[PDB]
Design a protein around this motif. Structure first.
Motif, PDB file in Angstrom:
ATOM      1  N   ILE B 226      11.887 -39.670 -39.629  1.00 41.67           N
ATOM      2  CA  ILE B 226      13.031 -40.078 -38.784  1.00 41.67           C
ATOM      3  C   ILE B 226      14.220 -40.327 -39.662  1.00 41.67           C
ATOM      4  O   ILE B 226      15.328 -39.926 -39.336  1.00 41.67           O
ATOM      5  N   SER B 227      13.971 -40.998 -40.777  1.00 38.82           N
ATOM      6  CA  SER B 227      15.031 -41.358 -41.736  1.00 38.82           C
ATOM      7  C   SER B 227      15.674 -40.185 -42.485  1.00 38.82           C
ATOM      8  O   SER B 227      16.912 -40.074 -42.546  1.00 38.82           O
ATOM      9  N   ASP B 228      14.862 -39.306 -43.054  1.00 37.71           N
ATOM     10  CA  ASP B 228      15.315 -38.361 -44.067  1.00 37.71           C
ATOM     11  C   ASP B 228      15.269 -36.835 -43.724  1.00 37.71           C
ATOM     12  O   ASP B 228      15.792 -36.004 -44.512  1.00 37.71           O
ATOM     13  N   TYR B 229      14.614 -36.481 -42.631  1.00 40.51           N
ATOM     14  CA  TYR B 229      14.271 -35.064 -42.365  1.00 40.51           C
ATOM     15  C   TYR B 229      15.543 -34.321 -42.066  1.00 40.51           C
ATOM     16  O   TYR B 229      16.355 -34.821 -41.315  1.00 40.51           O
ATOM     17  N   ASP B 230      15.670 -33.137 -42.661  1.00 42.71           N
ATOM     18  CA  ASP B 230      16.832 -32.236 -42.578  1.00 42.71           C
ATOM     19  C   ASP B 230      16.434 -31.041 -41.740  1.00 42.71           C
ATOM     20  O   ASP B 230      15.697 -30.196 -42.216  1.00 42.71           O
ATOM     21  N   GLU B 231      16.917 -30.982 -40.512  1.00 39.10           N
ATOM     22  CA  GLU B 231      16.602 -29.892 -39.588  1.00 39.10           C
ATOM     23  C   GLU B 231      17.300 -28.553 -39.908  1.00 39.10           C
ATOM     24  O   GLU B 231      17.000 -27.511 -39.300  1.00 39.10           O
ATOM     25  N   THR B 232      18.181 -28.571 -40.904  1.00 41.99           N
ATOM     26  CA  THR B 232      18.795 -27.332 -41.399  1.00 41.99           C
ATOM     27  C   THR B 232      18.180 -26.818 -42.703  1.00 41.99           C
ATOM     28  O   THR B 232      18.684 -25.860 -43.278  1.00 41.99           O
ATOM     29  N   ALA B 233      17.069 -27.430 -43.130  1.00 37.28           N
ATOM     30  CA  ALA B 233      16.256 -26.979 -44.272  1.00 37.28           C
ATOM     31  C   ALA B 233      15.415 -25.801 -43.841  1.00 37.28           C
ATOM     32  O   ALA B 233      15.525 -25.383 -42.733  1.00 37.28           O
ATOM     33  N   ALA B 234      14.550 -25.292 -44.711  1.00 42.27           N
ATOM     34  CA  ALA B 234      13.832 -24.084 -44.461  1.00 42.27           C
ATOM     35  C   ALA B 234      12.502 -24.280 -43.781  1.00 42.27           C
ATOM     36  O   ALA B 234      11.641 -23.398 -43.846  1.00 42.27           O
ATOM     37  N   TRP B 235      12.319 -25.408 -43.104  1.00 38.50           N
ATOM     38  CA  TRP B 235      11.097 -25.601 -42.325  1.00 38.50           C
ATOM     39  C   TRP B 235      10.916 -24.679 -41.137  1.00 38.50           C
ATOM     40  O   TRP B 235      11.886 -24.362 -40.443  1.00 38.50           O
ATOM     41  N   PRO B 236       9.662 -24.285 -40.850  1.00 39.91           N
ATOM     42  CA  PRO B 236       9.308 -23.508 -39.662  1.00 39.91           C
ATOM     43  C   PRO B 236       9.795 -24.236 -38.435  1.00 39.91           C
ATOM     44  O   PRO B 236       9.887 -25.482 -38.413  1.00 39.91           O
ATOM     45  N   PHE B 237      10.023 -23.472 -37.380  1.00 41.56           N
ATOM     46  CA  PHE B 237      10.450 -24.007 -36.129  1.00 41.56           C
ATOM     47  C   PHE B 237       9.517 -25.087 -35.566  1.00 41.56           C
ATOM     48  O   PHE B 237       9.970 -26.095 -35.012  1.00 41.56           O
ATOM     49  N   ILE B 238       8.219 -24.872 -35.658  1.00 42.60           N
ATOM     50  CA  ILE B 238       7.303 -25.822 -35.077  1.00 42.60           C
ATOM     51  C   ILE B 238       7.412 -27.224 -35.740  1.00 42.60           C
ATOM     52  O   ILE B 238       7.162 -28.244 -35.075  1.00 42.60           O
ATOM     53  N   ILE B 239       7.844 -27.253 -36.994  1.00 35.13           N
ATOM     54  CA  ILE B 239       8.032 -28.547 -37.714  1.00 35.13           C
ATOM     55  C   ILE B 239       9.333 -29.161 -37.202  1.00 35.13           C
ATOM     56  O   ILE B 239       9.345 -30.378 -36.925  1.00 35.13           O
ATOM     57  N   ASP B 240      10.379 -28.340 -37.000  1.00 35.84           N
ATOM     58  CA  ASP B 240      11.593 -28.851 -36.370  1.00 35.84           C
ATOM     59  C   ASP B 240      11.323 -29.447 -35.001  1.00 35.84           C
ATOM     60  O   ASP B 240      11.869 -30.477 -34.687  1.00 35.84           O
ATOM     61  N   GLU B 241      10.480 -28.798 -34.195  1.00 38.05           N
ATOM     62  CA  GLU B 241      10.204 -29.226 -32.842  1.00 38.05           C
ATOM     63  C   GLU B 241       9.413 -30.547 -32.906  1.00 38.05           C
ATOM     64  O   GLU B 241       9.645 -31.479 -32.148  1.00 38.05           O
ATOM     65  N   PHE B 242       8.571 -30.649 -33.926  1.00 35.23           N
ATOM     66  CA  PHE B 242       7.748 -31.893 -34.152  1.00 35.23           C
ATOM     67  C   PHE B 242       8.691 -33.053 -34.431  1.00 35.23           C
ATOM     68  O   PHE B 242       8.587 -34.104 -33.813  1.00 35.23           O
ATOM     69  N   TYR B 243       9.604 -32.869 -35.361  1.00 37.57           N
ATOM     70  CA  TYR B 243      10.727 -33.835 -35.568  1.00 37.57           C
ATOM     71  C   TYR B 243      11.476 -34.306 -34.314  1.00 37.57           C
ATOM     72  O   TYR B 243      11.742 -35.503 -34.162  1.00 37.57           O
ATOM     73  N   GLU B 244      11.824 -33.374 -33.431  1.00 39.80           N
ATOM     74  CA  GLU B 244      12.556 -33.682 -32.195  1.00 39.80           C
ATOM     75  C   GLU B 244      11.721 -34.515 -31.282  1.00 39.80           C
ATOM     76  O   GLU B 244      12.152 -35.437 -30.639  1.00 39.80           O
ATOM     77  N   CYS B 245      10.458 -34.188 -31.217  1.00 37.50           N
ATOM     78  CA  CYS B 245       9.511 -34.957 -30.446  1.00 37.50           C
ATOM     79  C   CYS B 245       9.266 -36.345 -31.083  1.00 37.50           C
ATOM     80  O   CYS B 245       9.143 -37.323 -30.366  1.00 37.50           O
ATOM     81  N   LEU B 246       9.179 -36.466 -32.419  1.00 35.36           N
ATOM     82  CA  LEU B 246       9.104 -37.810 -33.018  1.00 35.36           C
ATOM     83  C   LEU B 246      10.374 -38.591 -32.743  1.00 35.36           C
ATOM     84  O   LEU B 246      10.310 -39.774 -32.398  1.00 35.36           O
ATOM     85  N   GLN B 247      11.533 -37.961 -32.896  1.00 35.64           N
ATOM     86  CA  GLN B 247      12.747 -38.724 -32.637  1.00 35.64           C
ATOM     87  C   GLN B 247      12.926 -39.127 -31.155  1.00 35.64           C
ATOM     88  O   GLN B 247      13.486 -40.171 -30.874  1.00 35.64           O
ATOM     89  N   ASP B 248      12.369 -38.331 -30.245  1.00 39.66           N
ATOM     90  CA  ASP B 248      12.362 -38.615 -28.809  1.00 39.66           C
ATOM     91  C   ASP B 248      11.419 -39.759 -28.446  1.00 39.66           C
ATOM     92  O   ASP B 248      11.607 -40.428 -27.415  1.00 39.66           O
ATOM     93  N   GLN B 249      10.395 -39.949 -29.286  1.00 40.72           N
ATOM     94  CA  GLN B 249       9.300 -40.870 -29.029  1.00 40.72           C
ATOM     95  C   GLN B 249       9.571 -42.255 -29.580  1.00 40.72           C
ATOM     96  O   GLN B 249       8.650 -43.056 -29.734  1.00 40.72           O
ATOM     97  N   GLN B 250      10.821 -42.552 -29.896  1.00 41.74           N
ATOM     98  CA  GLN B 250      11.153 -43.934 -30.223  1.00 41.74           C
ATOM     99  C   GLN B 250      12.212 -44.559 -29.286  1.00 41.74           C
ATOM    100  O   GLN B 250      12.718 -45.664 -29.555  1.00 41.74           O
TER     101      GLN B 250
END
Lengths: 250, 250
Positions: B226-250
Motif C-alpha cells: 500500500i505504501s510503496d508499490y509503483d503501478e507504472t513499474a514492470a509488473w504483470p497486470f495481475i499484480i497491478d490488479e492485486f494492488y488495486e484490490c488491496l488498496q480497495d480493501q482498506q
C-alpha cells in the motif's frame, strides 16, 4: 503502426523497460507527449520508491548498447567486474543471469531482478557475489555439474547440435583442473586431447560432453582404465575408441 | 526389422541398457543366442568390475515397470525414501535426476549416473543425499529460486503453456513457508490466494509465476505494498490488479 512507434520512441528517449513504456502510454491516452511528462514528473523525487535502487539501474544503463544489453555490454561488464569472457566464473555469472545463449541480448528485467534477489546494487556487491559462486564451483559437485553441462549449451552456436573440438578442449582444460571437484590424472587428460587431435575429431556432441565427466570420475587414471574399463558398458563409441588407443599405446 | 527385434528381446531378457544390447549383439554377429551367452558368461564373477555397484543397479531394476522407470516407479521409489510426490524434497530429487517432465520415463543411465556422481549406491545413501539437498533448499537462495522456477516446468502438462491455479496455490503454500529463504507476511499470502479465487483466475503463466517470487521479496507485507508499490513499474497486470484490490480493501 502509430502505437508501436510510440512505444519504441518512448523506450528510446527514457531508456525504460518496454512494459513501462506501454503503461505510461496507456495512462496518457497513447500520446507520447503527455506520457513523457507523466513519467518525468514521477522521476523527480508523492511518488513511490523505485522498484530497484538507483545504483543498480545505473549499472545496467551504463553498459547498454543502442537500447540492448548485448554481447558487447556483457564483455564490457565482466571486464569491469574483473574477469574475462572465457573465465569459469563468467559461466557462473551467465548462468545466474539466465542466459540461454550469449548472443541473445539480456532482458533489462532479467539483469535487475537477478542482482536484486542476490542483495546487490553496486559493482562491488556484484564482485562479492561472483566470488561466492566461484567458491561454490570449487566446493559443490551438483553445482559444478550444472555449470559443466551449462557450458556446452552456452558454447553451442545458433542452429548447431555439437561444439567444435577446440572450444570443448579449451573448456575441459578449465573444468578438469584439480582445484575443482572432479580430480583426475594429468597424463590421462593429455592422452584424451592427443587422441581427439590424432583422430581428427572436429565436433563434440552433448552425449559425449556429458559422459566424459562421468568417465573421468569413474576412471581417473590411465592404469584404472586399462585395468577396469568395460567395453560392453554403455559408453559412447568415442570413449571405447579412446580405450583401444590407450591399450594400444602400451 | 530383425535387428531391431533382437535388440528389444535382448533388452527384455537381461534388463540391460539398450546401448549395451547393441554392443553385445554387435560382438556376436547380431545373433541373440550368442549375445546372451557372451553377456552371462560376463555376469558370472577375467571380467571387469561393473561400471556401477551391484547395489545401485538393483535399486533401479527393483522399481522398473515393464522395462520403464515411469511415474509409477518414481512414486514407489520416493515412497521407499520417505517422501510424497508433492513434497518440495521431491522436486529437488527430480531436479537432481534430470527430469524435464514427470510423465516421461527416466533413462536408466540418468538414474545410475546421478547417484554414482553423488557417491550413493544404497537407499540409505540416497536418503542422506536428499536430506542434504533439503538443507540447501532452506539455506541457499540461488538454489531455492532454481527449484521454484523448476517446479512450474515440472507441473506443466503436455502441450500447455500455463498451470492450473489450484496446483500453483498448492506449491506457493509450500514454497512461501517462513523456513525457506523468501520470508513474507502470512496475511499477504492469504490475501493473494483470496484474490485469485475472487477473480476466478484459472491458470498461471510462467511470467506470473516467476514475477511473484520477485514481488514477495520486494514487498513482503500488505502495508509495504500500500505504501510503496509503483503501478507504472514492470509488473504483470495481475499484480497491478492485486494492488488495486488491496488498496480497495482498506
Amino acid at each position: 503502426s502509430p502505437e508501436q512507434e510510440a512505444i519504441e520512441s518512448f523506450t528510446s528517449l527514457t531508456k525504460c523497460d518496454p512494459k513501462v513504456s506501454r503503461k505510461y502510454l496507456q495512462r496518457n491516452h497513447w500520446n507520447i507527449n503527455y506520457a513523457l511528462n507523466d513519467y518525468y514528473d514521477k522521476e523527480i523525487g508523492v511518488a513511490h520508491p523505485p522498484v530497484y535502487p538507483k545504483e543498480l539501474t545505473q549499472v545496467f544503463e551504463h553498459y547498454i548498447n543502442n537500447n540492448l544489453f548485448d554481447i558487447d555490454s556483457l564483455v564490457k561488464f565482466i571486464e569491469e567486474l574483473g574477469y574475462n569472457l572465457e573465465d569459469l566464473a563468467t559461466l557462473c555469472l551467465a548462468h545466474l543471469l539466465g542466459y540461454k545463449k550469449l548472443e541473445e541480448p539480456l532482458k533489462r528485467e532479467d539483469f535487475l531482478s537477478t542482482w536484486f534477489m542476490q542483495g546487490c546494487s553496486t559493482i562491488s556487491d556484484m564482485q562479492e557475489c561472483i566470488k561466492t559462486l566461484d567458491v561454490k564451483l570449487h566446493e559443490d559437485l551438483q553445482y559444478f555439474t550444472q555449470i559443466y553441462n551449462y557450458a556446452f549449451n552456452l558454447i553451442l552456436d545458433p542452429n548447431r547440435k555439437d561444439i567444435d573440438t577446440d572450444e570443448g578442449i579449451q573448456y575441459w582444460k578449465l573444468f578438469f583442473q584439480p582445484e575443482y571437484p572432479v580430480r583426475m590424472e594429468p597424463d590421462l587428460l593429455e592422452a584424451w586431447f592427443r587422441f581427439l587431435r590424432d583422430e581428427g575429431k572436429t565436433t563434440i556432441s552433448k552425449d559425449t560432453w556429458r559422459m566424459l565427466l562421468l568417465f573421468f570420475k569413474r576412471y581417473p587414471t590411465i592404469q584404472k582404465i586399462i585395468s577396469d574399463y568395460d567395453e560392453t558398458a554403455a559408453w559412447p563409441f568415442i570413449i571405447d575408441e579412446f580405450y583401444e588407443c590407450l591399450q594400444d599405446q602400451q
